[PDB]
């Protein structure tokens, strides 16, 4: 668990590409799991 | 023309091997029949389907 900008949420998948998927948090190609995300704007920061 | 029985063995062997190599050029519905195109043009989750 972590926080990101709203546009980055689309990168959290097996085989995705982008700055977060390259340099911060990457899944394996055979991932077995769930990805959950929400617009926590009230954290703003 | 007498040796047609033996010449047919040579022709059938050649015809079958040429057909097996020709079939490398076919797409089979993939975006290209050249494997390095697919690997260089697509991200892995798309490339594996092709």
Swiss-Prot record, chain A:
- Full-protein residues shown here are 399 to 448 of 1273
Q: What interactions and quaternary structure are annotated?
A: Binds to host ACE2. RBD also interacts with the N-linked glycan on 'Asn-90' of ACE2. Cleavage of S generates a polybasic C-terminal sequence on S1 that binds to host Neuropilin-1 (NRP1) and Neuropilin-2 (NRP2) receptors. Interacts with host integrin alpha-5/beta-1 (ITGA5:ITGB1) and with ACE2 in complex with integrin alpha-5/beta-1 (ITGA5:ITGB1). May interact via cytoplasmic c-terminus with M protein. May interact (via N-terminus) with host bilirubin and biliverdin, thereby preventing antibody binding to the SARS-CoV-2 spike NTD via an allosteric mechanism.
Q: Region (Integrin-binding motif) spans which residues?
A: 5-7
> What's the name of the protein?
Spike protein S1
Specify the effect of residue 7 to N: In strain: Omicron/BA.2, Omicron/BA.2.12.1, Omicron/BA.2.75, Omicron/BA.4, Omicron/BA.5, Omicron/BQ.1.1, Omicron/XBB.1.5, Omicron/EG.5.1; complete loss of interaction with host integrins
What this chain does, per the entry, is described as: Attaches the virion to the cell membrane by interacting with host receptor, initiating the infection. The major receptor is host ACE2. When S2/S2' has been cleaved, binding to the receptor triggers direct fusion at the cell membrane. When S2/S2' has not been cleaved, binding to the receptor results in internalization of the virus by endocytosis using host TFRC and GRM2 and leading to fusion of the virion membrane with the host endosomal membrane. Alternatively, may use NRP1/NRP2 and integrin as entry receptors.
**Organism the protein comes from:** Severe acute respiratory syndrome coronavirus 2
């Amino acid at each position: 668990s972590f926080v990101i900008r709203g546009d980055e949420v689309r990168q959290i998948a097996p085989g995705q590409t982008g700055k977060i998927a390259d340099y911060n948090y990457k899944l394996p190609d055979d991932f077995t799991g769930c990805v959950i995300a929400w617009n926590s704007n009230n954290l703003d920061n | 023309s007498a040796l047609g029985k033996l010449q047919n063995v040579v022709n059938q062997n050649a015809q079958a091997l040429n057909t097996l190599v020709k079939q490398l050029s076919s797409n089979f519905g993939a975006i290209s029949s050249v494997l390095n195109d697919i690997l260089s043009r697509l991200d892995k989750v798309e490339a594996e389907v092709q």
